[PDB]
Amino acid sequence: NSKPLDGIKVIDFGGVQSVPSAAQLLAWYGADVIKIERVGVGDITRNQLRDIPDADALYFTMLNCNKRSVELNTKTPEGKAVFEKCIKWADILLENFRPGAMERMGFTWEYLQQLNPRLIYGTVKGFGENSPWAGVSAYENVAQCAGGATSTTGYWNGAPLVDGQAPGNNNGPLVSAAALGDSNTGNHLLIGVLAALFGRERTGKGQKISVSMQDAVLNLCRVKLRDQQRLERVGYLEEYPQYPNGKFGDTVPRGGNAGGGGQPGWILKCKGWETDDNAYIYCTVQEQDWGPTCEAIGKPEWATDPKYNTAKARETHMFEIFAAIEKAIADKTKYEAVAHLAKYRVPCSPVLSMKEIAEAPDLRESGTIVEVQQPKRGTFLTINPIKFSGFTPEIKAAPLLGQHTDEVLAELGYSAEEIKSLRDKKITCA
Amino acid sequence: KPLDGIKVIDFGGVQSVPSAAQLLAWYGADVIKIERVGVGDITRNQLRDIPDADALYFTMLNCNKRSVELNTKTPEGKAVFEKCIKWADILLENFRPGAMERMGFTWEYLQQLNPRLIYGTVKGFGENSPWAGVSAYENVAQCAGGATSTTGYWNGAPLVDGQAPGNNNGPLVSAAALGDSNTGNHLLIGVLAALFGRERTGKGQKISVSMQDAVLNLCRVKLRDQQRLERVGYLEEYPQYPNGKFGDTVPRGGNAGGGGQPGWILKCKGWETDDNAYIYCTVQEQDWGPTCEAIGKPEWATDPKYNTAKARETHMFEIFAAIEKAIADKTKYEAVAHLAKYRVPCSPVLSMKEIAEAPDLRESGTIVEVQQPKRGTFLTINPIKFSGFTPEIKAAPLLGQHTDEVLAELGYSAEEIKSLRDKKITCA
Numbered sequence A: 001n002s003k004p005l006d007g008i009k010v011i012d013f014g015g016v017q018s019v020p021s022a023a024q025l026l027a028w029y030g031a032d033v034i035k036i037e038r039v040g041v042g043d044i045t046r047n048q049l050r051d052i053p054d055a056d057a058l059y060f061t062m063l064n065c066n067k068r069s070v071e072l073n074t075k076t077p078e079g080k081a082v083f084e085k086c087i088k089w090a091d092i093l094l095e096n097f098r099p100g101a102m103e104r105m106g107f108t109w110e111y112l113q114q115l116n117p118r119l120i121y122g123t124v125k126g127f128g129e130n131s132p133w134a135g136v137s138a139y140e141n142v143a144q145c146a147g148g149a150t151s152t153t154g155y156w157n158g159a160p161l162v163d164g165q166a167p168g169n170n171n172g173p174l175v176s177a178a179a180l181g182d183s184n185t186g187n188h189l190l191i192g193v194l195a196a197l198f199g200r201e202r203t204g205k206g207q208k209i210s211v212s213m214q215d216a217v218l219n220l221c222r223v224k225l226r227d228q229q230r231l232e233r234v235g236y237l238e239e240y241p242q243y244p245n246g247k248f249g250d251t252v253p254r255g256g257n258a259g260g261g262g263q264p265g266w267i268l269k270c271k272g273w274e275t276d277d278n279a280y281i282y283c284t285v286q287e288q289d290w291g292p293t294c295e296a297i298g299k300p301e302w303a304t305d306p307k308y309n310t311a312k313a314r315e316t317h318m319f320e321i322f323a324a325i326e327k328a329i330a331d332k333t334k335y336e337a338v339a340h341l342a343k344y345r346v347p348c349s350p351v352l353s354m355k356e357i358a359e360a361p362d363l364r365e366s367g368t369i370v371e372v373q374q375p376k377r378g379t380f381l382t383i384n385p386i387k388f389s390g391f392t393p394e395i396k397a398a399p400l401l402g403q404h405t406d407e408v409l410a411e412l413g414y415s416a417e418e419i420k421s422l423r424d425k426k427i428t429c430a
Numbered sequence B: 001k002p003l004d005g006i007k008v009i010d011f012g013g014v015q016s017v018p019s020a021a022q023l024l025a026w027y028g029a030d031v032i033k034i035e036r037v038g039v040g041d042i043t044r045n046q047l048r049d050i051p052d053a054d055a056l057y058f059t060m061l062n063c064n065k066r067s068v069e070l071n072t073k074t075p076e077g078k079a080v081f082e083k084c085i086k087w088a089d090i091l092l093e094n095f096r097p098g099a100m101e102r103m104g105f106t107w108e109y110l111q112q113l114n115p116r117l118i119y120g121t122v123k124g125f126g127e128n129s130p131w132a133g134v135s136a137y138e139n140v141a142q143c144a145g146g147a148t149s150t151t152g153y154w155n156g157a158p159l160v161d162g163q164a165p166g167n168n169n170g171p172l173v174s175a176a177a178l179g180d181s182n183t184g185n186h187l188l189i190g191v192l193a194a195l196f197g198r199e200r201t202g203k204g205q206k207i208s209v210s211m212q213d214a215v216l217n218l219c220r221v222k223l224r225d226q227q228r229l230e231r232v233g234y235l236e237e238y239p240q241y242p243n244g245k246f247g248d249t250v251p252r253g254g255n256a257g258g259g260g261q262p263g264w265i266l267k268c269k270g271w272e273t274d275d276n277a278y279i280y281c282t283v284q285e286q287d288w289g290p291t292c293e294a295i296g297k298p299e300w301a302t303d304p305k306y307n308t309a310k311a312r313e314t315h316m317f318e319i320f321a322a323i324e325k326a327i328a329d330k331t332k333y334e335a336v337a338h339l340a341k342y343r344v345p346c347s348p349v350l351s352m353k354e355i356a357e358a359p360d361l362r363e364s365g366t367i368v369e370v371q372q373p374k375r376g377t378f379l380t381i382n383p384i385k386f387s388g389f390t391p392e393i394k395a396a397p398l399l400g401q402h403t404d405e406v407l408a409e410l411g412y413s414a415e416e417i418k419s420l421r422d423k424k425i426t427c428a
């Protein structure tokens, strides 16, 4: 029924993924969200990798549902004055433009507070204010490289040798498909903004939330910072693939598809792997019930072999064990492999392609993947991750550029003459 | 502090719930962590680096909490749990499916115990998922959510240095905790939203997040790509275009950059012995001239085979190779400085050692040194900064350190507390 953010007013003053994704979530939870975009072209996502020539790209519609679009050139004195009225209207202002942009536009945090002492200002940059990289261009992959994720993702070089490795020392840092830099930073920003919004109820005061992309990536790599400290003290990482047949250095190495503390595991080929990039499962060799594991893979002999039957003894032979499992499932599809290993309660799970995910009926039924009616496009799918017992979001079309400009100006108190004037002066259009 | 006076129960383990609860404590919440007797949160005993001290896994996830040791499978322990629930504004839980219910603590019951309770629950999958039975481990979530399928290298053309040979390029796990920490962030978002709405409605609610869904959410762009793929049959920005083939599902793209401009991770001097002697580099449309100078290929500036993004598509990997050649004799930092002079966008790949020791990160309070009993100091991460306050981060609790203290605040007499202890409801 009633939505938690009903009557909360938000300005989405950003682009791409971090800020818009957070603002989209706010709208879905009830917020009145207006997106102020540059004239003529709007948010960069509108025009990036279109699949339908005359329509807004999917990048944009999947990040900007339930918003109203305001076209506005804040780099003009008239535009700035309109923006200042918007700022007074809003509870929340979110921005992620390049370092110094807001400042050159006339909007220091000090000034923003002057305009609206209730304002909760959320700002995202690639790096913290004091970083030696503050001048680096902050793309998704730059944040992943800066925050420890690429360093610690992918394969190691050398022993133990495994099929997925590149030859020699060509196993380098690897980018993650997940938006550690973008959407993830948005999540962190939303945490800060909502904490601030709650605190504002008692104090009546706004404040500034700052999240850097590097820091948000690092937060998701908290366990890698854990491992770094273990490594420095202990000299090795016992659960890593390199122990005991490889070599550790002074920094956390890449670990392939390793399971981690107390739950050793790996991603294994299934029938069809040579032509199907997703004919794979994940399988754990658990530190209990080794007996059933042995039977599942046809190694009943291992249940008693002193070289296997203790959690801490199969610690050293895992890759032989993984190979035995793949041999046991080499004739099975991933779904057949899972069903076979489940017979014995060997914990495992399929690797699911985006096609299988997109088509999954259980994800439609739960409201996690939602089909949305979009003009000039038809329908498209979006993701709604967090479920509330009290209400369900009503997800609606993403706005055309400037579709609501005059409606919002009117809502702000501008007469019909000033509105035509602003559009005449090319403040609200190109 | 914005969560001052808010009462929170951490009734979870590992990362998702405890990380969310730790942030809450940092923002001012009064957080108690109810842990099973004797061993407590699994993170306490996992990969200890100091034998008789709690593991770093635990300390980095449980600062600023009080520990209550409690056997919630006993009728005495259940009674205690119920009093805590009535005390609490927020209850967070991530135990295996049906576990809360088996104790009798259904959502329907919790709503009646405390109509103001905000209840956050994490599970591997949605309740009606065909995978609902499956053990919800981090790598499982990454595999179910789309991440592993779309992370790693493709097989076949175009052939590049970091590929496995033949068709041995498979799904790959990300170092980032997509399934665990990321899920706790999503949980926290819903919890803070409901906490706010409670101000107007006066009632709590239940927030549910599945690990599969949280992973999927971070892979929003890959669901975008799936729909693009299904509509047009190819993806313009992927390494496979134009020289490879697209199938029916989004393929792995190695170190490719998203939308804006082509990019890749390039070797620098020392890559044969230093796993992290690398940078990330983007090939910009603008300033192609300086880019050509930067790599000792002035020859390319006027060449219509190269001087436009469109002509470059067919041989983007030739371009990257030339850049690598030009920085073959430079460290990643030297490579960065060289390439920046020509306005080519690039950045170093940083190792965990480099990050952990970074003075800017200590100075901003992003990496924080914490004093911890039986250990000395360790480092933790605090990612969101507030102009209104700065968290005062303190030691993670010893197991049951605050049991008797919390029970006394809950109104238990010293005699009740002593019997609970003697009967081993509050200890092993």
Ligand SMILES: CC(C)(COP(=O)(O)OP(=O)(O)OC[C@H]1O[C@@H](n2cnc3c(N)ncnc32)[C@H](O)[C@@H]1OP(=O)(O)O)[C@@H](O)C(=O)NCCC(=O)NCCS
Pocket (backbone or CB within 6 Å): A015, A016, A017, A018, A019, A036, A037, A038, A039, A072, A073, A074, A075, A096, A097, A098, A099, A100, A101, A102, A104, A105, A124, A125, A126, A137, A138, A139, A140, A181, A182, A213
């Ligand atoms: C993504 C990014 C690199 C884009 O680079 P960019 O397109 O070259 O620069 P921006 O789009 O950020 O900003 C360009 C200018 O447009 C201006 N602008 C923004 N909105 C405007 C509007 N409605 N009207 C007129 N001008 C506007 C900005 O103020 C900025 O002015 P400036 O010349 O004084 O700097 C940059 O936004 C960034 O680093 N963001 C920080 C972290 C982040 O969230 N990145 C997002 C993707 S991972």
Ligand SMILES: CC(C)(COP(=O)(O)OP(=O)(O)OC[C@H]1O[C@@H](n2cnc3c(N)ncnc32)[C@H](O)[C@@H]1OP(=O)(O)O)[C@@H](O)C(=O)NCCC(=O)NCCS
Pocket (backbone or CB within 6 Å): B013, B014, B015, B016, B017, B034, B035, B036, B037, B070, B071, B072, B073, B094, B095, B096, B097, B098, B099, B100, B102, B103, B122, B123, B124, B135, B136, B137, B138, B179, B180, B211
């Ligand atoms: C992490 C996980 C896989 C562990 O599985 P597990 O160790 O076999 O089981 P759990 O630790 O969750 O719970 C075991 C039991 O201890 C009980 N328990 C929890 N706290 C207790 C306490 N203080 N006293 C007594 N019993 C307690 C639980 O109720 C549960 O009871 P049950 O036998 O009726 O099911 C599982 O907790 C999980 O799937 N959680 C959901 C998603 C998640 O966040 N996973 C984290 C890893 S990425």
